[PDB]
Amino acid sequence: DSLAPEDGSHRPAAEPTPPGAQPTAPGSLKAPDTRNEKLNSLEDVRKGSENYALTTNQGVRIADDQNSLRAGSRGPTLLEDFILREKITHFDHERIPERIVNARGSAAHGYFQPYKSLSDITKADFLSDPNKITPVFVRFSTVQGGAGSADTVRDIRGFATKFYTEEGIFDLVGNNTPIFFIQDAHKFPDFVHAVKPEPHWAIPQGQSAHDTFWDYVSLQPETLHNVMWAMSDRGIPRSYRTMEGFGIHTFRLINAEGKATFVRFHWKPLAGKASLVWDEAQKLTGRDPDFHRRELWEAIEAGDFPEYELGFQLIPEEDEFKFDFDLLDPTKLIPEELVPVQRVGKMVLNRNPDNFFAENEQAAFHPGHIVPGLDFTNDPLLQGRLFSYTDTQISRLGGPNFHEIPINRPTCPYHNFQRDGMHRMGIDTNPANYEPNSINDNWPRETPPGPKRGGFESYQERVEGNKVRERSPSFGEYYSHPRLFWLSQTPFEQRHIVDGFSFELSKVVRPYIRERVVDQLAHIDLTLAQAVAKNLGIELTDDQLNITPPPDVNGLKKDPSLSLYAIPDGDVKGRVVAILLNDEVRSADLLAILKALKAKGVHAKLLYSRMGEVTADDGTVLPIAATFAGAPSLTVDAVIVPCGNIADIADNGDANYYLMEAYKHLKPIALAGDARKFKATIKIADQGEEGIVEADSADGSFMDELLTLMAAHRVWSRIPKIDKIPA
Amino acid sequence: DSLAPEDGSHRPAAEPTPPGAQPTAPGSLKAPDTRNEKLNSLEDVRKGSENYALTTNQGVRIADDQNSLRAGSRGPTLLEDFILREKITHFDHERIPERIVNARGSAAHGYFQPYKSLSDITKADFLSDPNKITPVFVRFSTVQGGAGSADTVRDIRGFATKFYTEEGIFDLVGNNTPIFFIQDAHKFPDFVHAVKPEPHWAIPQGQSAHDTFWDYVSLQPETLHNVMWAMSDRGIPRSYRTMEGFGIHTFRLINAEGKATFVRFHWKPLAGKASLVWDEAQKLTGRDPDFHRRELWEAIEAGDFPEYELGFQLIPEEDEFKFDFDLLDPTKLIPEELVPVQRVGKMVLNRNPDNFFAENEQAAFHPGHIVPGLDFTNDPLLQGRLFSYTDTQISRLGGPNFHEIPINRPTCPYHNFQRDGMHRMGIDTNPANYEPNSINDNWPRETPPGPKRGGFESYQERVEGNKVRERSPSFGEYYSHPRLFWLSQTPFEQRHIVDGFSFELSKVVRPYIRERVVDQLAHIDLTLAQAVAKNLGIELTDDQLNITPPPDVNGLKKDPSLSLYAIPDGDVKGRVVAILLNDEVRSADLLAILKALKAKGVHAKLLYSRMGEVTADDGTVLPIAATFAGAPSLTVDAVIVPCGNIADIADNGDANYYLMEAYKHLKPIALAGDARKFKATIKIADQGEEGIVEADSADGSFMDELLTLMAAHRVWSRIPKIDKIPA
Ligand code: HEM
Ligand code: HEM
């Protein structure tokens, strides 16, 4: 009709803007100048809308899209209404099966570039030149929950990267923890069935806190390593931008000379490692189930591009057997103290999709999608994965032509003799659909392996053994890695691990399962087991107290790289601060607060007891972003309360609870002038306490102190003080 | 190996037990003696497991289900491992498209029986005889969210009942509010797209609190009536057991003499009407996203069978045009003050399914599945619905033979000339697959319509009009029903509606959309409009303040049946109380508490600061159901704190916060003896306060007070006191 407002406020500016400043929008409209080879190649399927007539799918203009065709205006709908029927039919068939695992996921476009040529160790084209840019499409995910499940659950996170290289698609399909729960792919359905919603009633969603998961864990000790990671704060990341990424399996790099080097893939978050605390994460699944999806999208819209450093742990063929653990066992990590991560390149995620369904939901990643210069190994979990993705994608994406779905298409040439299949888009003109052929002079033709642009040839690994359904004896060690992980965590991280196990085991209805898990923990570490046991009202037996701890891992009694927080790596850019306003805010405090945050790329959200505007002490009109209940402290990293008429909000339950919640979840809180009246709400001494910034105004060192706390992420020293506190 | 505990505590007793007393289980194992004709008919496909060997799907016994076949124990997996491939293939193809709408749902089996023969007004066989029982399968659902989204969201709820009648399946596919948002089915995709997650980023899940929903509502005033219901506490039911159900459309009843009677279907919850409060509901989506699913299942295992009374609003054919609203307009309700609901029958849900996916996920309901004695009307929303379910089920359930999926099969005979189609189960022996045929003597044959067991014949409604895509002018009234609903709510219900709109609209990023919705509210009721406007910092214009209120609906200024709470209908059976234990609980208090609770069929959950057991003062060993954090006050209806060693939990932050949350959410709290010291935490009253039961001990009078409060559901009088509490 012409329903947009005349000021054009319905449309977001096509420029980087902080979270909440403008309505979010499709990537190509929000950042039309952000391009890459893949993004450009999707132009052929992008469809606009402005200034076009509304039509059926056959191109017939529709005159009345408000009504069905009927006999009389109060009459029965007629079967000849082909417009109604096409519109309802398309609607009716909108859904496709969600992914069997990792159904819940958020994705974005970006680019990768290596720091230097890696031609000495791999002939992979995308790693051969620092000036060679490779477009990427990355999807981050949870594992257990459906596509409509919540983001901030306790779960492993998926981190899949589709590299659109010049010699083929390479998919690096990893997780946020360096090991997996099981050793052999044949047990994948068992493990996944155990963690997913139980079959009689389909509960619980997005949670491993139920009997079947812990039943399986209790009977399969190989799972303990990854379970330790899931129970730690690693299982509840702050953002996809602040978690590590790992390929898990040992793969191979193959150079032009034919030499194979073992490699484990790593992604280092350039924004640092950061996680939530359980109570916050759990409550956040309720207040904002799309928190991570939203955070990713808004970071990219703000220009806070998620950046990750690709790194390789490289192990020479001759050192295959030099560790206490098997390199092919996916339940074992390779300690960075033993084998350092060599920095390979940077990946920048800088554009959101246009349509979530088309690009995100239909994206298909496969660990078997490798390119010349990479190869597999006999890791028995990897081995089975190679079969699985291929197979699942035929039903999820409706046929064998899912590579023709725009997001999945290679940007490089693809030609072969494969034909037909449902939804076939490519119209082949080749006279031949077989090889060898003479009728097209055998094209397209095979290409011999070579240093560059050659055909794929598998590394000639020697195979010797009998056909057996047997686990290698080298994989039969289940407690040393869990123990190495435990010992590398800080004391507060250890507490969070104990708390994760205790909470989860409390949701296990059959007590003997709890006892059985406690017994497994006693094979890992007595302190851990005792602390969890105490929380479950379980007493360890004398035999359990005497279980000898498992050996160190190749002489290591700890590796600080396994901790989220042992080694400071805090980055404040992209974080957000809640600013609790009052009806006569000290404008000078606001100026100082907002400019200091802006200088470090920290966002702010101005909150009040209602929407609309508040007028500062000098007449400054302040637009309110959200109410205290509307945007809870769960969604921010810190809280600042400026001076002004504090009596306006002093007796406001939400405003007080805002601070109690933020205080409980170890977030920095800064109170200026009369906002110090709020100290009694959170029980802060007159003298003050580490983690609380306070002063007469927000002028001198006030913001620098607050930003130092934000750099350290959370105030871990406050843990004992939050023990009481009714919040 | 991995075997059950020696004591047999791995298996739930096959008798009715209170929630939490036993692990939940498939229905046929929990209640083997509970049967009905449909439940029995599913015996052909039920598969047991105990004492059977593990096999492939082809019946080959598996020797080693822990490993893949490889060449050497550290070698590559072989392609000939057919056991692994079948296992992984089946896993890879587990998912099927979720429902386009109402993907999140919970279902159970039961039975229905009419109170008296309704043969005078309908020839429908299932309503012909009071002693003729009809098996039912019911699915309750949310609408917007995916299958893995949370239960306690603010949304409409679906209430679909499949009646397995002797003359065919009859599906009564309704909702928990008596009207729908839109008028014509042609706009269903528009409305559903507006409320679903926005297309660029697929946010938000299970929420209408986003720009596109309010944008559509603001431009389509026909939606306002159902929006009012959604924003009220109707949008967040406490249980599927405590909400009303409605067919929404006017349908027809056809008796044996051919007389048509207009009818609107109702379901009255025999457990009464009860809803959560927003803060509680939202937080509960985080603490237990499966709350409603769990609550339904546990009520059924406990013997608290959900019971509903089928009721009919009957309007003679001659009275079609006597109201000031059109009967065929699905955005209009028929006030009970004008047309009473006649009680028709009782439906009892007494058994959970065995496998959620097979029975719930694959269940297919259709408003078009009617039987002789029923007929449609020209309601344009209903008309389009007849097309849509059939169509969507062909892709969701993979073919045209979805009626052969066990849960969907009729229990009556079904014979016809339809053949083939994907996954055809029925093997037809008829020599003929067409009619008329002489080769099978024309069987199966058509059956003339008649009083009983006749063929279906449409009521011969007179149709007169031109082929038009036009909305009836009689449907063009959008504010009188919203206003009637508003005026029928209690003052606290009105406040909750205001708060619902205020919350939702604060999440709308484009301010003009908020203003447009406020403008629409001003056409309904100025008090409502002003209350919302004030929360959004919006000022009504002089024109808006002068908008004339819509007329009353046929002289009604209110109708108390539209309120959840105006007319008391409280029923405590099946409700649950949290009991906050201490390490030296007064057994005399527990005795009196449980006795009183037991008499009213109210359950209890014993909570503590740790799991395991606590021993009362008399040596009674009490198993702990959950910790204070583990089962928040959100999950219960009231909280009781017995006396004993109160010092044990007096300074416990979670225990204090438990009471503050329950207090804020208007739940009855009862404190005995030294537990009265907890009154300080909820900063309120000295003498006493209505809603807080207190005494020197938990006695008969103490429990009578608490149970009386529980029968009123929540302590509405405490509302003014909760906005200061920091919780
Ligand atoms: C190291 C262990 C594993 C890792 C790191 C891993 C990682 C992932 C990730 C990140 C995704 C989602 C990709 C996306 O965002 O679309 C995924 C999906 C999937 N995974 Fe794996 N996974 C592992 C083990 C396995 C195993 C053992 C199997 C079966 C043999 C398996 C089968 C699947 C399937 C069927 C999907 C769905 C793919 C689709 O529908 O496109 N995964 N996995
Ligand atoms: C009075 C208005 C409506 C009511 C009360 C209603 C009710 C329901 C319910 C309760 C379900 C879920 C059934 C289950 O539990 O499986 C459902 C599903 C569905 N509804 Fe309706 N609906 C309405 C309007 C419409 C309209 C106008 C259309 C399309 C023209 C439509 C299309 C669908 C579809 C396609 C499904 C999915 C069915 C399946 O996949 O089996 N609905 N509806």
PDB file of C-alpha atoms in Angstrom, chain A residues 416-596:
ATOM      1  CA  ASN A 416      31.949 -35.507 -13.909  1.00  0.00           C
ATOM      2  CA  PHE A 417      29.716 -38.190 -15.391  1.00  0.00           C
ATOM      3  CA  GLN A 418      27.161 -38.249 -12.563  1.00  0.00           C
ATOM      4  CA  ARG A 419      23.623 -37.502 -13.787  1.00  0.00           C
ATOM      5  CA  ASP A 420      20.007 -37.035 -12.688  1.00  0.00           C
ATOM      6  CA  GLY A 421      18.747 -37.454  -9.129  1.00  0.00           C
ATOM      7  CA  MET A 422      15.961 -35.429  -7.513  1.00  0.00           C
ATOM      8  CA  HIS A 423      16.153 -31.662  -7.952  1.00  0.00           C
ATOM      9  CA  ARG A 424      18.869 -31.858 -10.668  1.00  0.00           C
ATOM     10  CA  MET A 425      19.866 -28.285 -11.559  1.00  0.00           C
ATOM     11  CA  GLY A 426      22.901 -28.711 -13.835  1.00  0.00           C
ATOM     12  CA  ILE A 427      21.974 -29.426 -17.468  1.00  0.00           C
ATOM     13  CA  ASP A 428      24.821 -31.549 -18.850  1.00  0.00           C
ATOM     14  CA  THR A 429      25.690 -31.120 -22.518  1.00  0.00           C
ATOM     15  CA  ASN A 430      28.349 -33.818 -22.527  1.00  0.00           C
ATOM     16  CA  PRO A 431      27.483 -36.396 -25.186  1.00  0.00           C
ATOM     17  CA  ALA A 432      28.968 -38.976 -22.785  1.00  0.00           C
ATOM     18  CA  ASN A 433      27.792 -39.829 -19.268  1.00  0.00           C
ATOM     19  CA  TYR A 434      30.470 -42.507 -18.771  1.00  0.00           C
ATOM     20  CA  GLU A 435      34.261 -42.943 -19.017  1.00  0.00           C
ATOM     21  CA  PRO A 436      36.188 -44.154 -20.698  1.00  0.00           C
ATOM     22  CA  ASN A 437      34.482 -42.704 -23.751  1.00  0.00           C
ATOM     23  CA  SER A 438      35.599 -41.781 -27.252  1.00  0.00           C
ATOM     24  CA  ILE A 439      32.483 -39.756 -28.154  1.00  0.00           C
ATOM     25  CA  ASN A 440      33.595 -36.738 -26.096  1.00  0.00           C
ATOM     26  CA  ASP A 441      37.292 -37.635 -26.355  1.00  0.00           C
ATOM     27  CA  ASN A 442      37.160 -38.887 -22.767  1.00  0.00           C
ATOM     28  CA  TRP A 443      36.378 -35.471 -21.190  1.00  0.00           C
ATOM     29  CA  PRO A 444      36.187 -34.643 -18.468  1.00  0.00           C
ATOM     30  CA  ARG A 445      39.442 -36.465 -17.756  1.00  0.00           C
ATOM     31  CA  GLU A 446      41.315 -37.816 -14.769  1.00  0.00           C
ATOM     32  CA  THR A 447      44.346 -35.853 -13.571  1.00  0.00           C
ATOM     33  CA  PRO A 448      47.486 -37.462 -12.137  1.00  0.00           C
ATOM     34  CA  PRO A 449      48.609 -36.408  -8.665  1.00  0.00           C
ATOM     35  CA  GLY A 450      51.210 -33.629  -8.677  1.00  0.00           C
ATOM     36  CA  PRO A 451      52.434 -30.652  -6.674  1.00  0.00           C
ATOM     37  CA  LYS A 452      49.604 -28.295  -7.705  1.00  0.00           C
ATOM     38  CA  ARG A 453      46.192 -28.843  -9.383  1.00  0.00           C
ATOM     39  CA  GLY A 454      46.646 -32.630  -9.434  1.00  0.00           C
ATOM     40  CA  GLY A 455      44.194 -35.469  -8.841  1.00  0.00           C
ATOM     41  CA  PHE A 456      43.526 -36.858  -5.375  1.00  0.00           C
ATOM     42  CA  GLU A 457      45.556 -39.940  -4.463  1.00  0.00           C
ATOM     43  CA  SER A 458      45.400 -41.514  -1.007  1.00  0.00           C
ATOM     44  CA  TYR A 459      48.612 -41.752   0.983  1.00  0.00           C
ATOM     45  CA  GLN A 460      49.893 -45.332   0.603  1.00  0.00           C
ATOM     46  CA  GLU A 461      49.639 -46.302   4.257  1.00  0.00           C
ATOM     47  CA  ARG A 462      50.628 -49.876   5.004  1.00  0.00           C
ATOM     48  CA  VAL A 463      47.708 -51.980   6.218  1.00  0.00           C
ATOM     49  CA  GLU A 464      48.406 -55.272   8.029  1.00  0.00           C
ATOM     50  CA  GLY A 465      46.094 -57.260  10.279  1.00  0.00           C
ATOM     51  CA  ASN A 466      43.145 -59.636  10.206  1.00  0.00           C
ATOM     52  CA  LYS A 467      39.572 -58.444   9.571  1.00  0.00           C
ATOM     53  CA  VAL A 468      38.468 -57.872  13.175  1.00  0.00           C
ATOM     54  CA  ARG A 469      35.796 -56.116  15.207  1.00  0.00           C
ATOM     55  CA  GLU A 470      38.301 -55.227  17.896  1.00  0.00           C
ATOM     56  CA  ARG A 471      39.248 -52.154  19.900  1.00  0.00           C
ATOM     57  CA  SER A 472      42.995 -51.529  19.869  1.00  0.00           C
ATOM     58  CA  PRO A 473      44.516 -52.304  23.280  1.00  0.00           C
ATOM     59  CA  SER A 474      46.315 -48.904  23.108  1.00  0.00           C
ATOM     60  CA  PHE A 475      42.890 -47.200  23.437  1.00  0.00           C
ATOM     61  CA  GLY A 476      42.015 -48.985  26.693  1.00  0.00           C
ATOM     62  CA  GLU A 477      43.086 -46.213  29.124  1.00  0.00           C
ATOM     63  CA  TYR A 478      40.340 -43.877  30.325  1.00  0.00           C
ATOM     64  CA  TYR A 479      41.405 -41.846  33.349  1.00  0.00           C
ATOM     65  CA  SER A 480      44.773 -40.200  32.762  1.00  0.00           C
ATOM     66  CA  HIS A 481      43.414 -37.542  30.338  1.00  0.00           C
ATOM     67  CA  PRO A 482      40.443 -36.669  32.552  1.00  0.00           C
ATOM     68  CA  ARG A 483      42.942 -36.290  35.431  1.00  0.00           C
ATOM     69  CA  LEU A 484      45.324 -34.160  33.319  1.00  0.00           C
ATOM     70  CA  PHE A 485      42.372 -31.913  32.483  1.00  0.00           C
ATOM     71  CA  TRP A 486      41.224 -31.686  36.104  1.00  0.00           C
ATOM     72  CA  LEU A 487      44.685 -30.743  37.387  1.00  0.00           C
ATOM     73  CA  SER A 488      45.131 -28.007  34.765  1.00  0.00           C
ATOM     74  CA  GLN A 489      42.038 -26.081  35.870  1.00  0.00           C
ATOM     75  CA  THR A 490      42.128 -23.208  38.354  1.00  0.00           C
ATOM     76  CA  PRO A 491      40.532 -23.814  41.760  1.00  0.00           C
ATOM     77  CA  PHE A 492      37.323 -21.970  40.790  1.00  0.00           C
ATOM     78  CA  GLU A 493      37.178 -23.893  37.492  1.00  0.00           C
ATOM     79  CA  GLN A 494      37.522 -27.112  39.499  1.00  0.00           C
ATOM     80  CA  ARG A 495      34.644 -25.992  41.720  1.00  0.00           C
ATOM     81  CA  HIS A 496      32.507 -25.357  38.616  1.00  0.00           C
ATOM     82  CA  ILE A 497      33.339 -28.859  37.355  1.00  0.00           C
ATOM     83  CA  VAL A 498      32.304 -30.346  40.711  1.00  0.00           C
ATOM     84  CA  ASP A 499      29.119 -28.243  40.588  1.00  0.00           C
ATOM     85  CA  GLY A 500      28.329 -29.345  37.014  1.00  0.00           C
ATOM     86  CA  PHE A 501      28.652 -33.039  37.877  1.00  0.00           C
ATOM     87  CA  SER A 502      26.668 -32.551  41.104  1.00  0.00           C
ATOM     88  CA  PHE A 503      23.801 -30.693  39.430  1.00  0.00           C
ATOM     89  CA  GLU A 504      23.575 -33.136  36.526  1.00  0.00           C
ATOM     90  CA  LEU A 505      23.786 -36.209  38.773  1.00  0.00           C
ATOM     91  CA  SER A 506      21.037 -34.741  40.985  1.00  0.00           C
ATOM     92  CA  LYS A 507      18.732 -34.947  37.933  1.00  0.00           C
ATOM     93  CA  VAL A 508      19.515 -38.661  37.552  1.00  0.00           C
ATOM     94  CA  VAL A 509      16.503 -40.326  39.188  1.00  0.00           C
ATOM     95  CA  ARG A 510      18.044 -43.773  39.790  1.00  0.00           C
ATOM     96  CA  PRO A 511      20.521 -43.340  42.643  1.00  0.00           C
ATOM     97  CA  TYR A 512      22.764 -46.292  41.687  1.00  0.00           C
ATOM     98  CA  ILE A 513      23.691 -44.458  38.445  1.00  0.00           C
ATOM     99  CA  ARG A 514      24.882 -41.522  40.578  1.00  0.00           C
ATOM    100  CA  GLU A 515      26.946 -43.905  42.717  1.00  0.00           C
ATOM    101  CA  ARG A 516      28.451 -45.587  39.649  1.00  0.00           C
ATOM    102  CA  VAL A 517      29.529 -42.212  38.229  1.00  0.00           C
ATOM    103  CA  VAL A 518      31.033 -41.256  41.587  1.00  0.00           C
ATOM    104  CA  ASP A 519      33.024 -44.506  41.472  1.00  0.00           C
ATOM    105  CA  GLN A 520      34.395 -43.605  38.017  1.00  0.00           C
ATOM    106  CA  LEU A 521      35.352 -40.136  39.309  1.00  0.00           C
ATOM    107  CA  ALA A 522      37.281 -41.809  42.166  1.00  0.00           C
ATOM    108  CA  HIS A 523      39.483 -43.432  39.488  1.00  0.00           C
ATOM    109  CA  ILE A 524      40.295 -39.941  38.201  1.00  0.00           C
ATOM    110  CA  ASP A 525      40.900 -37.865  41.313  1.00  0.00           C
ATOM    111  CA  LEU A 526      39.959 -38.365  44.938  1.00  0.00           C
ATOM    112  CA  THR A 527      39.328 -34.661  45.621  1.00  0.00           C
ATOM    113  CA  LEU A 528      36.932 -34.403  42.673  1.00  0.00           C
ATOM    114  CA  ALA A 529      35.080 -37.595  43.619  1.00  0.00           C
ATOM    115  CA  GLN A 530      34.796 -36.611  47.278  1.00  0.00           C
ATOM    116  CA  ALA A 531      33.417 -33.136  46.508  1.00  0.00           C
ATOM    117  CA  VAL A 532      30.814 -34.524  44.089  1.00  0.00           C
ATOM    118  CA  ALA A 533      29.948 -37.353  46.492  1.00  0.00           C
ATOM    119  CA  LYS A 534      29.401 -34.866  49.339  1.00  0.00           C
ATOM    120  CA  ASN A 535      26.996 -32.842  47.180  1.00  0.00           C
ATOM    121  CA  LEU A 536      25.061 -36.038  46.384  1.00  0.00           C
ATOM    122  CA  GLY A 537      24.979 -37.275  49.994  1.00  0.00           C
ATOM    123  CA  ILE A 538      27.199 -40.209  48.993  1.00  0.00           C
ATOM    124  CA  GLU A 539      30.043 -41.597  51.090  1.00  0.00           C
ATOM    125  CA  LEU A 540      33.093 -43.047  49.358  1.00  0.00           C
ATOM    126  CA  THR A 541      34.040 -46.559  50.459  1.00  0.00           C
ATOM    127  CA  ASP A 542      37.513 -47.253  51.878  1.00  0.00           C
ATOM    128  CA  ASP A 543      38.361 -49.003  48.593  1.00  0.00           C
ATOM    129  CA  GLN A 544      37.280 -45.919  46.629  1.00  0.00           C
ATOM    130  CA  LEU A 545      39.500 -43.723  48.809  1.00  0.00           C
ATOM    131  CA  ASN A 546      42.430 -46.037  47.986  1.00  0.00           C
ATOM    132  CA  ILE A 547      42.063 -46.145  44.201  1.00  0.00           C
ATOM    133  CA  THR A 548      45.480 -45.190  42.916  1.00  0.00           C
ATOM    134  CA  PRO A 549      45.357 -42.165  40.647  1.00  0.00           C
ATOM    135  CA  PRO A 550      46.124 -42.739  36.975  1.00  0.00           C
ATOM    136  CA  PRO A 551      49.605 -41.889  35.728  1.00  0.00           C
ATOM    137  CA  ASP A 552      50.587 -38.463  34.433  1.00  0.00           C
ATOM    138  CA  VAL A 553      50.399 -38.006  30.648  1.00  0.00           C
ATOM    139  CA  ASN A 554      53.973 -38.360  29.374  1.00  0.00           C
ATOM    140  CA  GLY A 555      55.301 -36.868  32.620  1.00  0.00           C
ATOM    141  CA  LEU A 556      52.923 -33.874  32.608  1.00  0.00           C
ATOM    142  CA  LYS A 557      51.035 -33.144  35.839  1.00  0.00           C
ATOM    143  CA  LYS A 558      49.239 -30.165  34.307  1.00  0.00           C
ATOM    144  CA  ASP A 559      49.004 -28.132  31.098  1.00  0.00           C
ATOM    145  CA  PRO A 560      47.732 -24.556  31.514  1.00  0.00           C
ATOM    146  CA  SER A 561      46.465 -24.408  27.913  1.00  0.00           C
ATOM    147  CA  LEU A 562      43.619 -26.723  29.015  1.00  0.00           C
ATOM    148  CA  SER A 563      42.239 -24.041  31.338  1.00  0.00           C
ATOM    149  CA  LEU A 564      39.947 -21.279  30.145  1.00  0.00           C
ATOM    150  CA  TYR A 565      41.335 -18.769  32.609  1.00  0.00           C
ATOM    151  CA  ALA A 566      44.707 -19.902  34.034  1.00  0.00           C
ATOM    152  CA  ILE A 567      46.540 -17.767  31.431  1.00  0.00           C
ATOM    153  CA  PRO A 568      44.869 -14.371  30.950  1.00  0.00           C
ATOM    154  CA  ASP A 569      43.750 -13.731  27.365  1.00  0.00           C
ATOM    155  CA  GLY A 570      40.875 -11.312  27.944  1.00  0.00           C
ATOM    156  CA  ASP A 571      39.580  -9.074  25.153  1.00  0.00           C
ATOM    157  CA  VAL A 572      36.920  -6.461  25.938  1.00  0.00           C
ATOM    158  CA  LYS A 573      35.943  -5.458  22.384  1.00  0.00           C
ATOM    159  CA  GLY A 574      32.423  -6.697  21.589  1.00  0.00           C
ATOM    160  CA  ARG A 575      31.441  -7.085  25.256  1.00  0.00           C
ATOM    161  CA  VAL A 576      28.442  -5.166  26.622  1.00  0.00           C
ATOM    162  CA  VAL A 577      27.601  -3.166  29.721  1.00  0.00           C
ATOM    163  CA  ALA A 578      24.157  -2.519  31.188  1.00  0.00           C
ATOM    164  CA  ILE A 579      23.721   1.112  32.309  1.00  0.00           C
ATOM    165  CA  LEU A 580      20.959   1.499  34.904  1.00  0.00           C
ATOM    166  CA  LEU A 581      19.426   4.916  34.445  1.00  0.00           C
ATOM    167  CA  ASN A 582      17.363   7.120  36.718  1.00  0.00           C
ATOM    168  CA  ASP A 583      15.098  10.093  35.888  1.00  0.00           C
ATOM    169  CA  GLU A 584      17.812  12.719  36.498  1.00  0.00           C
ATOM    170  CA  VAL A 585      21.093  11.073  35.489  1.00  0.00           C
ATOM    171  CA  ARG A 586      24.338  12.993  35.952  1.00  0.00           C
ATOM    172  CA  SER A 587      25.062  13.776  32.276  1.00  0.00           C
ATOM    173  CA  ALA A 588      28.791  14.104  33.076  1.00  0.00           C
ATOM    174  CA  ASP A 589      28.880  10.482  34.283  1.00  0.00           C
ATOM    175  CA  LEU A 590      27.144   9.283  31.122  1.00  0.00           C
ATOM    176  CA  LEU A 591      29.575  11.151  28.871  1.00  0.00           C
ATOM    177  CA  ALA A 592      32.573   9.624  30.655  1.00  0.00           C
ATOM    178  CA  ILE A 593      31.041   6.155  30.802  1.00  0.00           C
ATOM    179  CA  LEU A 594      29.853   6.020  27.184  1.00  0.00           C
ATOM    180  CA  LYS A 595      32.977   7.470  25.588  1.00  0.00           C
ATOM    181  CA  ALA A 596      35.308   5.182  27.589  1.00  0.00           C
TER     182      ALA A 596
END
